[PDB]
Design a protein around this ligand. Structure first.
Ligand SMILES: Nc1ncnc2c1ncn2[C@@H]1O[C@H](COP(=O)(O)OP(=O)(O)OP(=O)(O)O)[C@@H](O)[C@H]1O
Ligand SMILES: Nc1ncnc2c1ncn2[C@@H]1O[C@H](COP(=O)(O)OP(=O)(O)OP(=O)(O)O)[C@@H](O)[C@H]1O
Lengths: 373, 592, 406, 302
């Protein structure tokens, strides 16, 4: 809540100017894209908190149906009663005229802030061009302030709409990522020294993730670990060269063991399903690139290679078929004919080769020259 | 076509049904109750670590959301029982706000939230004494303002069969505002924690706090329930080694579950109580002495005339044969001590079988039996000292004579020192007999000669094959393997192969008489590559032309074609030939 | 002062609310075609149903409300009971009937029986209105209206417009071109044809005049000296050839006359703090804040692991062309590039390389068409990536050598 | 079909005595089914010949007292909606809820836990067929039959018939598997399916039309119009899922991707939409003629 800017001042100021004072009209709709790191709700919430433009805030992650997205907008707006119910959209534009006729916001440009609008994209085809024209659909000094993860070019309805004014909130630059990744609040060191730690950590680490949230998390972990040998041992260079031996392994390490005990015929089932998925260009006849993935194959071929793999005392009982259905619910095999029938469709293999190697080796079987070579 | 008719108990069917059925209901209900307790005791080391972890991750709330991903086994058949026990333990020592989601009652998000708030509403309204999302938060804000604001936890039972869309949206909703409503979800991963990376993309997987728990790997679960349920002296109904071999095979090969095993033992006990008229006296020994003394005389002729007793007749003298043959009043006297000898053989059998289990589990590489299950198997399939496997133990046990063997003689002795007076009367007072051998363990030759007299006395005295050694053993033993196996686990793909290839039921048909349908399939697979229709109609017509002349042609072509089309709709219907669309016609060889 | 807040209040409304400014240019013959038709449908009982088509952002709603205001000014309020509909709100028939009930003041009589035949429904609405009488139907955004389940509030309006002969104009406002070909054949053969408008723009040297007549402070007087000062400044900016340079650049992307409102809207937002009379360079940066490249701002900000991955995907088009790839071929090309390189800074191990993919899927540069090694699709251009890799500020030399190799 | 079936049963099935005897072997095994079914098991019984008349003789000898919902599965009218509807009215003696399948499922579960000894048991002929099965469909039979007060008997005919039972779904109803053979030809299936020697007519489309939502009815209008409007183009190889998703979304008929995919797989059940994989790997959709597609939505709107 504290720092409104942390040097992103020009985008803040053009957005701050664009709102204007209360008694005159503003834009109908503003669309702000950017990366997920870039403060697109930190900047707009600490901008809107200062002037208290009387606003409603929503996430559309929360509202999975259309009725809740209208209900919370109307219910949060009338406080600035009972649940003022809207089943349909024309109910929202009807009840909107009564709600925004109060002295708090009769003249004031009400902002209906919509967050993470890419989840609104697949709500309906109605609601997005129905919300972009709200300044003259209901005519009550509104400005629907969008923000999103996604580019505007995909977001358009392909009929067209009121094209909103589009801002690009910039990504944080390198010296700006030195400054705004916690140059304020270092508790016990000098801010020179915490910036010296993170100025070393960041320049090494500015190639995997420029996300500010996780880098605040990683820095508030590996800074107190860096901190402890200074205040215990005692010179930034020496513990710079101590902190990078720990930083490489903490980079690499941010999945217990792959091996799962299975009943013995299910082991031989998915051994057979692997062996019929990964080299299967009618090479059944021989024994008895790889990179593209698993090729699908029918059930009767799997059953034939099952008979060749196992010792021959198998019978097709109800349990060996019921197990071969029950391997699919645990997502070790997949059906790729989605509805081709109950009769045996193509079942393609979906487990990685190391896991299959371990499953084959825990029952007496070395298979890699047998698998694709 | 589902026409309903409206209408507008002790029936079982000699073995007289009323005390038969109450004997059934007593034995099976007793076994099920002790089954559920010996489930809930083993899991206490697992989930009473869990109460510690959930207590620690709740109490430090003054950016994160805690998940404890259990790794339960591949058996989905008994995953309800561990979650019933875990719901009980978490409900008692932590909050009375515990809900569980099934992953079949919520395909998408509206059902998820509607079923979760209804389960939470009944769960809060009982122990205090709706499609909306933030009203759930208002429920937690109303319902628990106090008592350290207890954390409401959801139990996703299957992590796997959830779609990723609805689960991702719920985790971002719940992690968005857990200021009020602290939520600690515990999804039960069926495979291994690897797949929580697979089903959750990295943003939502970064949102949460993962701490994984093991679960009881399943072979040392069924060693406890096999060991406690049938290996004891206590339960009146034992089981044959072949029927047990059938039951424990379809555990360890196909199913890997324990609820199927207890269904298998349930079916064995039911079929035993149906089968034979001497099954009524499957009881403890005074309850046996209750109505051995009064009973119908034809069932006592059956207690004379079942084959193991007539072996006992074959080994005995004439002067008591002439009275014990027919008369009831002495036949009670000899059969009562025969049932006492049955209980005697069971009681001196199982204790030193457990002794031999400890003394053989101590060994390197363990050649006889891996575990306590299979020792029952090896001492009953072949005769044990006849077989090479106990020959291999006896060949092993000589030069193993060191302080490892003396130390584990001490340790095995200690665990059946607890079973010294838990046996509490042996049937030879074998506890203080073998303990009288086993009391010089504190004070290298003595381990060898003490070993010699101990295994020879033990194994040659009681450890032998139960049918021939003991008459009247039909009463406690139920044995029918391939009568039960087809009831429990059948094969229709082998039945159709047998009754379509060889439909010989009892006049000449084994290698042209009494099908229509086997004529159709057998003639289809006399031309064994693939087929077209008209020539197949002419070929079927040819072989039943042979049938007609081995007892006009145009009428015969009509009736042959009509019965052909009745046959070929079945041969499509039963999962063979699947119709070859848009061509002139053909049938496709779909099963070889 | 009085001037800055008054100019921004009076110019901002006609500027960005698309408020009714009285100057209308390019549309004089279409308007004049509309007025006598509206006067003879409104003044007399007969009902004719004109239809309007044009592009988005030009023409329609301004014309129909301007002609409506001028016709309302004539009396004998004439009792024309206008009923505004929109295509976006009233999606279905049941909402449409109660919406006509709402506009036409019907709930004095209760009418609380859903009737089966909806021609009796519409005839009842017009019937209780008629005994109580002209209506003018402005059916806006007709292209969403042409997706009814049964096309009732298309068709029954046309049948009543020929058959009931209560005074009616079904004035459709559309956006897509084929209003006839999309319309279903019983209605389109029934009564769709009354005389169809077509709407388009005009020439650039008059479009600079519509810039000046748009921007100039109106005949409304905030303070007449400040209007003379500022509209003279508008003309001085207008006669300068750099504003004419940026305005011709704006014509050849946008003939819209809505894009001009936004382009100038950012300019006037900049103006009131200092220099109230502004530069051509201020209109230049006002154009410049309106972006040209929506995807360079997405690709320019990405860290360089996503850069060498995205140019690996571009390289996956330049060998083994046109398949929707999976992860493994991307990993293979990235590894063959890093094994071409000597240094081991950028040989980042496999589980990190998935994190770049599941971040890059959220930008929808890559597309899903089995779970994490399948059939992923690239929707992009080479040349925007080739421009983006030189404008990357901390772009390393090895990914530059990757770009030059390609 | 009919003049082919006049000739059926003219003279001489070539054995009779062992067929009466092989069916007369199984009449001794019925009181076992009654006892085994009272304890909580469920009998599936498979076979090679017709055993549905055996189940009818079974219900005549031992089900004159109890409720039985004989669900045929061989004729194409029955899917599990009709099961739940008929069990709700004609067994519970009052109609139930109407909002969803899961609502009436949970509701029809709910009546049995409170009302002791109501003792209803259905029996199903031909539980595996083209219409009865399905993971939406078979689980409702499962979850319904898991209780103590419902005892289903089935018959599975297929060769791959226990492929639709994973372990969890198998433990809803405790199966034990009888073996039966009768050799009687399955006259009801072969009667009421089809005969090839003579596409789908108007009746089953009327039944699917009258058992579904009006929005699903609005959906197939769009699909049948895009099919009929391009019927004589041999390059039209069907709409994709995304084109159909946007053209169904613009007409407000459905909201999400998953709802349309579920509607597509339940309409892929009735064999009136066929998926085709092109060279993209994207599977386009085309259904099985043109003149029989004009008649419905000619008459569905005047
Ligand atoms: N300039 C800044 N100064 C301080 N903290 C910042 C700044 N920018 C971003 N943050 C961090 O980002 C958080 C706000 O996240 P942000 O505003 O990036 O969400 P968002 O952009 O709406 O997310 P998304 O784009 O994923 O919807 C703040 O809690 C803060 O931790
Ligand atoms: N000939 C013109 N005269 C005056 N203003 C015009 C003219 N052409 C376009 N405009 C302006 O362009 C915008 C057109 O808005 P209007 O809603 O009338 O048409 P539209 O936007 O194409 O309609 P829709 O909302 O269906 O797209 C308004 O700002 C209007 O002031």
């Amino acid at each position: 809540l504290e720092n409104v800017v942390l040097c992103r001042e020009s985008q803040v100021s053009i957005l701050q100017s664009l709102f204007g004072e209360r008694h005159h009209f503003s834009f109908p709709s503003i669309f702000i894209y950017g990366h997920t790191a870039s403060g697109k709700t930190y900047v707009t919430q600490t901008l809107l908190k200062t002037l208290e433009l009387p606003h409603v805030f929503v996430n559309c992650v929360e509202c999975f149906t259309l009725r809740l997205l209208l209900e919370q907008i109307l219910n949060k707006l009338n406080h600035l009663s009972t649940e003022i119910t809207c089943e349909t959209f024309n109910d929202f534009v009807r009840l909107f005229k009564q709600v925004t006729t109060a002295e708090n916001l009769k003249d004031q440009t009400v902002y209906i802030v919509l967050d993470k609008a890419e989840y609104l994209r697949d709500m309906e085809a109605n609601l997005l061009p129905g919300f972009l024209r709200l300044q003259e659909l209901a005519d009550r000094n509104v400005t629907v302030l969008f923000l999103s993860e996604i580019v505007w070019e995909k977001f358009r309805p392909n009929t067209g709409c009121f094209e909103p004014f589009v801002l690009y909130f910039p990504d944080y630059s390198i010296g700006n990522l030195q400054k705004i990744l916690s140059h304020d609040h270092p508790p016990e060191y000098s801010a020179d020294f915490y910036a010296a730690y993170i100025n070393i950590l960041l320049g090494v680490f500015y190639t995997v993730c420029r996300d500010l949230k996780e880098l605040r998390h990683l820095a508030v972990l590996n800074f107190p670990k860096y901190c402890e040998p200074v205040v215990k041992g005692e010179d930034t260079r020496k513990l710079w060269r101590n902190i990078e031996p720990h930083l490489k392994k903490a980079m690499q390490t941010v999945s217990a063991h792959t091996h799962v005990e299975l009943p013995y015929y299910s082991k031989f089932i998915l051994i057979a399903a692997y062996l019929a998925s990964y080299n299967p260009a009618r090479t059944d006849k021989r024994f008895f690139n790889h990179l593209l993935g698993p090729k699908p194959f029918p059930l009767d071929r799997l059953l034939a290679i099952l008979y060749s793999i196992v010792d021959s005392r198998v019978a097709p009982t109800a349990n060996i078929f019921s197990q071969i259905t029950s391997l699919v619910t645990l997502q070790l095999l997949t059906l790729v004919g989605h509805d081709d029938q109950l009769d045996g469709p193509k079942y393609k293999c979906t487990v990685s080769l190391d896991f299959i190697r371990a499953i084959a080796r825990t029952v007496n079987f070395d298979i890699i020259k047998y698998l694709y070579d | 076509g589902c026409f309903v008719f409206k209408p507008n108990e002790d029936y079982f069917n000699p073995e007289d049904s009323k005390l038969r059925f109450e004997t059934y209901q007593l034995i099976w209900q007793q076994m099920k109750s002790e089954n559920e307790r010996l489930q809930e005791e083993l899991n206490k080391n697992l989930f009473d670590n869990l109460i510690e972890f959930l207590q620690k991750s709740h109490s430090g709330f003054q950016r994160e959301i805690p998940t404890a991903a259990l790794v339960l086994g591949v058996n989905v058949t008994d995953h309800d029982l561990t979650f019933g026990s875990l719901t009980e333990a978490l409900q008692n020592n932590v909050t009375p706000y515990v809900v569980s989601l099934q992953a079949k009652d919520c395909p998408d998000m509206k059902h998820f939230l509607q079923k979760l708030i209804s389960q939470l509403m009944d769960c809060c309204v009982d122990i205090k004494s709706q499609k909306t999302d933030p009203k759930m938060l208002s429920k937690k804000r109303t319902t628990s303002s106090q008592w350290q604001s207890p954390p409401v936890v959801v139990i996703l039972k299957d992590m796997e069969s959830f779609a990723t869309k609805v689960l991702q949206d719920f985790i971002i909703i719940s992690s968005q505002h857990l200021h009020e409503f602290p939520l600690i979800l515990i999804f039960g991963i069926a495979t291994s924690p690897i797949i929580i990376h697979r089903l959750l993309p990295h943003a939502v997987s970064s949102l949460l706090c993962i701490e994984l728990f093991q679960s009881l790997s399943c072979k040392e679960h069924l060693t406890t329930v096999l060991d406690k349920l049938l290996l004891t002296t206590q339960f009146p109904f034992k089981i044959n080694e072949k029927v047990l071999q059938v039951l424990t095979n379809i555990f360890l090969y196909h199913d890997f579950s324990v609820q199927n095993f207890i269904k298998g033992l349930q079916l064995s006990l039911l079929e035993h109580f149906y089968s034979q008229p001497l099954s009524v006296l499957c009881c403890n020994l005074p309850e046996a002495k209750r109505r051995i003394n009064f009973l119908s005389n034809n069932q006592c002729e059956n207690i004379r005339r079942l084959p193991s007793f007539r072996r006992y007749v074959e080994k005995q003298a004439s002067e008591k044969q002439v009275a014990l043959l027919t008369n009831e009043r002495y036949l009670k006297e000899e059969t009562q001590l025969l049932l006492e000898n049955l209980h005697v053989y069971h009681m001196n059998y199982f204790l030193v079988l457990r002794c031999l289990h400890k003394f053989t589990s101590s060994l390197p590489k363990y050649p006889l039996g891996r575990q306590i299950r299979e020792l029952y198997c090896t001492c009953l399939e072949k005769n044990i000292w006849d077989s090479e496997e106990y020959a291999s133990v006896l060949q092993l046990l000589r030069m193993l004579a060191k302080d490892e063997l003396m130390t584990i003689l001490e340790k095995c002795f200690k665990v059946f020192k607890s079973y010294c007076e838990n046996h509490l009367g042996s049937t030879a007072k074998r506890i203080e007999e073998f303990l009288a051998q086993f009391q010089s363990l504190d004070e290298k030759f003595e381990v060898l000669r003490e070993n010699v007299v101990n295994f020879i006395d033990c194994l040659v005295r009681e450890y032998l094959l139960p049918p021939e050694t003991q008459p009247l053993h039909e009463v406690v033993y139920f044995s029918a393997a391939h009568a039960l196996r087809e009831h429990l686990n059948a094969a229709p793909r082998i039945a159709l192969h047998t009754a379509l290839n060889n439909p010989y039921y009892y006049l000449k048909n084994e290698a042209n008489i009494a099908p229509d349908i086997c004529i159709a399939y057998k003639l289809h697979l006399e031309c064994s590559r693939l087929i077209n229709l008209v020539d197949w109609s002419e070929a079927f017509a040819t072989v039943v032309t042979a049938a007609e002349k081995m007892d006009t042609s145009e009428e015969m072509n009509e009736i042959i074609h009509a019965r052909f089309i009745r046959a070929v709709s079945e041969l499509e219907l039963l999962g063979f030939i699947k119709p070859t669309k848009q061509k002139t016609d053909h049938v496709a060889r779909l099963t070889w | 002062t009085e001037c800055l807040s008054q100019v921004q209040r009076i110019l901002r409304e006609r500027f960005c609310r698309q408020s009714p400014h009285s100057n209308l240019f390019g549309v004089q013959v279409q308007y004049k075609h509309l007025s006598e038709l509206l006067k003879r449908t409104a003044l007399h009982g007969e009902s004719n149903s004109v239809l309007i088509i044009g592009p988005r952002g030009s023409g329609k709603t301004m014309l129909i409300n301007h002609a409506l205001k001028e016709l309302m000014e004539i009396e004998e309020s004439e009792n024309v009971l206008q009923v505004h509909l929109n295509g976006l709100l009233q999606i279905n028939d049941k909402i449409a009937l109660k919406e006509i009930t709402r506009q036409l003041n019907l709930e004095n009589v209760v009418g609380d029986k859903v009737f089966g035949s909806f021609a009796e429904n519409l005839s009842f609405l017009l019937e209780a209105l008629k005994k109580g009488c002209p209506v003018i139907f402005i059916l806006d955004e007709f292209d969403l209206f042409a997706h009814h389940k049964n096309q009732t509030l298309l068709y029954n309006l046309f049948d009543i417009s020929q058959s009931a002969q209560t005074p009616i104009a079904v004035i459709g406002l559309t956006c897509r071109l084929d209003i006839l070909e999309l319309l279903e054949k019983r209605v389109k053969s029934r009564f769709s044809h009354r005389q169809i408008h077509l709407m388009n723009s005009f020439g650039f040297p008059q479009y600079v005049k519509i810039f000046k007549e748009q921007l100039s402070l109106p005949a409304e007087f905030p303070d007449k000296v400040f209007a003379e000062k500022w509209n003279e400044n508008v003309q001085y900016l207008s006669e300068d050839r750099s504003v004419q340079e940026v305005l011709q650049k704006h014509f050849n992307i946008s003939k819209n006359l809505r894009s001009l409102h936004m382009l100038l809207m950012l300019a006037l937002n900049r103006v009131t703090a200092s220099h109230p009379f502004m530069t051509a360079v201020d209109l230049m940066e006002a154009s410049q804040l309106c972006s040209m490249d929506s995807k360079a701002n997405i690709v320019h900000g990405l860290s360089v692991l996503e850069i060498c991955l995205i140019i690996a995907m571009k390289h996956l088009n330049d060998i083994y062309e046109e398949e929707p790839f999976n992860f493994q071929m991307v990993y293979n090309e990235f590894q063959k590039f890093v094994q071409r390189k000597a240094h081991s800074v950028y040989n980042f191990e496999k589980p990190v390389v998935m994190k770049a993919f599941e971040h890059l899927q959220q930008l929808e540069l890559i597309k899903p068409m089995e779970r994490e090694y399948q059939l992923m699709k690239l929707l992009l251009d080479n040349t925007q990536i080739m421009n983006a890799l030189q404008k990357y500020p901390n772009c390393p030399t090895d990914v530059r050598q990757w770009a030059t190799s390609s | 079909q009919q003049t082919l079936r006049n000739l059926l049963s003219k003279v001489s099935p070539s054995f009779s005595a062992e067929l009466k005897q092989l069916n007369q072997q199984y009449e001794k095994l019925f009181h076992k089914w009654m006892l085994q079914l009272h304890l909580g098991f469920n009998i599936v019984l498979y076979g090679l010949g017709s055993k549905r008349d055996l189940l009818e003789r079974f219900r005549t000898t031992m089900l004159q007292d109890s409720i039985h919902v004989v669900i045929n599965g061989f004729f194409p009218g029955i899917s599990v909606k009709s099961v739940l509807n008929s069990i709700t009215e004609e067994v519970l003696d009052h109609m139930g809820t109407f909002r969803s399948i899961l609502d009436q499922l949970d509701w029809i579960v709910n009546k049995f836990k409170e009302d002791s000894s109501l003792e209803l048991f259905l029996l199903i002929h031909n539980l595996d067929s083209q219409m009865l099965r399905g993971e939406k469909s078979q689980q409702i039979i499962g979850q319904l039959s898991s209780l103590h007060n419902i005892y289903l008997i089935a018959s599975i005919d297929h060769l791959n018939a226990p492929l639709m039972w994973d372990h969890a779904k198998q433990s809803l109803f405790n199966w034990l598997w009888y073996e039966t053979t009768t050799y009687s030809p399955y006259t009801e299936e072969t009667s009421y399916e089809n005969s090839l020697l003579v596409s789908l007519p108007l009746s089953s489309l009327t039944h699917v039309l009258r058992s579904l939502t009006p929005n699903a009815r609005g959906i197939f209008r769009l699909l049948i119009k895009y099919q009929l409007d391009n019927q004589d183009n041999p390059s039209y190889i069907g709409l994709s899922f995304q084109d159909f998703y946007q053209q169904c979304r613009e007409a407000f008929l459905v909201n999400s991707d998953l709802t349309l995919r579920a509607q597509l797989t339940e309409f892929r059940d009735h064999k009136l939409i066929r998926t085709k994989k092109g060279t993209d790997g994207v599977e386009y959709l085309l259904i099985p003629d043109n003149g029989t597609l004009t008649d419905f939505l000619e008459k569905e709107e005047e």
